[PDB]
């Protein structure tokens, strides 16, 4: 799981989830990547599942870059409780994703296996994404 | 498309009749009648053919083209040479006989079963295992053949039942 070692403030507001990804929209580390198309909260659960999916599919040798970090905490007040008594305790972690941001990036020799591992990862995410290549 | 683009041969002994979009074919084995689709055109090429032609390439006519062509071809071949199907039996005690014009199966049921050959179809057993079904109509022969074929459940273990002539059944063996 990806968890920040510390955050200055542990109870923030929900990340504003509007607009198009301005920063981080290109594939730079590896040759193939997964590039997003919808706003969402990608938790570290989703990221871990997707990374393990890619590693299971390729399983030999190739680099997976998770160039998004879940470092924004969503809190949840304990069950069966009414409204009030202050904000809850943080208990899951999130990356704020805009349409445009390359989420995962992969470097691997062949084409079809790389594409299939990337779509295997895509299926684990709460959004629509597409496979994007290192060239325009 | 391409199949619907060539005309149908008509032999020197078989005579055709065209009226409106309806037509009929008459040959040594019998007679047959057939109706041709709406957008399609059927023409008597007097040089010895029947040409089926589609005015356009719209999917409906593109589709009905070859359909009508094959219908006319089946009509003519059925009136000239007829349509016959060979069909065999497998298993011990699975037997076939005749009764009048009907054909009787004894396939291990506690009662016999028997099929009455409908119009234009003549059953003909040539061996208690091997029998054939013949007719002037390609669709009727195939339909009654399929009806015969399914008088037993499929048998992937012993194969027993009514198989076609050239059919190779799939067979999986239980561990006992």
């Amino acid at each position: 799981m990806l968890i920040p070692r510390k955050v200055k403030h542990r109870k923030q507001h929900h990340p504003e989830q509007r607009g198009i990804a301005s920063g981080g929209t290109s594939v730079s580390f590896g040759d193939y990547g997964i590039q997003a198309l919808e706003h969402a909260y990608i938790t570290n659960r989703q990221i871990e599942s997707a990374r393990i999916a890619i590693n299971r599919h390729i399983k030999r040798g190739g680099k997976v870059w998770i160039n998004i970090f879940p470092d924004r905490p969503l809190t949840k007040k304990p069950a069966e409780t009414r409204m009030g008594s202050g904000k809850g305790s943080p208990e899951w972690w999130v990356a704020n994703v805009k349409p445009g941001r390359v989420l995962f990036e992969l470097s691997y020799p062949d084409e079809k296996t790389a594409r299939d591992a990337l779509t295997r990862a895509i299926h684990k995410l709460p959004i629509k994404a597409r496979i994007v290549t290192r060239e325009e | 498309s391409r199949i619907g683009k060539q005309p149908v041969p008509v032999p020197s002994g078989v005579d055709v009749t065209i009226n409106g979009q309806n037509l009929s074919v008459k040959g040594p084995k019998g007679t047959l009648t057939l109706d041709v689709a709406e957008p399609i055109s059927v023409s008597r090429a007097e040089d010895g053919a029947i040409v089926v032609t589609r005015p356009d390439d719209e999917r409906r006519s593109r589709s009905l083209h070859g359909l009508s062509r094959t219908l006319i071809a089946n009509l003519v071949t059925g009136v000239t040479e007829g349509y016959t199907q060979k069909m065999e039996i497998f298993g011990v005690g699975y037997r076939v006989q005749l009764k009048g014009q009907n054909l009787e199966f004894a396939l291990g049921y506690s009662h016999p079963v028997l099929i009455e050959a409908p119009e234009g179809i003549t059953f003909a057993v040539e061996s208690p295992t091997k029998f054939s079904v013949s007719g002037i109509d390609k669709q009727k022969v195939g339909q009654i053949s399929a009806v015969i074929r399914r008088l037993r459940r499929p048998d992937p273990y012993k194969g027993k039942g009514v198989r076609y002539e050239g059919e190779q059944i799939r067979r999986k063996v239980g561990k006992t």
Partner: protein
């Protein structure tokens, strides 16, 4: 090795703005601007289809011959503002250039060939800056990988650079690094 300039047509934008650009972009046209030592930022619509075609044929870095209302100019693509999602080119920047003119540029570097099988080749810098004439600009230059030894780095200073072109990047910028292929018990050990 002179590269023949590509011949596009363009015509002066009557009026400027986001509405005008959106409309022109809607009619299959690209808004662009000429500048350089021509000292006149000139606002030009050009054919979107032909622009994309020539960028396909000759990359991002290619000389063009612009026909501005009959006047004939030599241009070179400086920048392209492209949408992150719809991927259509939105805007173009065109330095004015003439023969015998050195210019700084960024040229893609595509690793070519197969490597030794036990390890994977991975590029950190896909683009290398070079100083070169307007016509003699290489659209792409290659780096050699043919059965390297164990993992080693490659930098811009040991590339077979073309003739008439000069490296601008500091020679110790890494381009392609062969790194040992992760084992079975090494690939899933990083990322959490």
């Amino acid at each position: 090795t002179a590269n023949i300039p590509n011949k596009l047509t363009a015509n002066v934008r009557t009026r400027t703005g986001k509405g005008a650009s959106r409309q022109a972009r809607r009619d299959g046209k690209v808004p662009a601007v000429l500048y350089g030592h021509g000292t006149d930022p000139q606002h030009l619509e050009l054919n979107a289809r032909d622009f994309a075609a020539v960028l396909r044929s000759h990359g991002t870095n290619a000389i063009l011959t612009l026909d501005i209302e009959g006047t004939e100019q030599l241009a070179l693509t400086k920048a392209l503002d492209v949408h992150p999602i719809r991927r259509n080119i939105q805007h173009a920047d065109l330095l004015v250039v003439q023969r015998g003119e050195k210019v700084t540029v960024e040229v893609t570097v595509l690793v070519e060939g197969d490597a030794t099988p036990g390890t994977l080749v991975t590029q950190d810098a896909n683009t290398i800056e070079i100083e070169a004439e307007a016509l003699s600009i290489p659209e792409q230059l290659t780096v050699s990988v043919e059965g390297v030894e164990a993992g080693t780095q490659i930098t811009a200073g040991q590339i077979s650079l073309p003739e008439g072109v000069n490296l601008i990047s500091d020679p110790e910028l890494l381009v392609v690094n062969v790194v040992e292929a992760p084992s079975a018990e090494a690939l899933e050990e990083e990322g959490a």
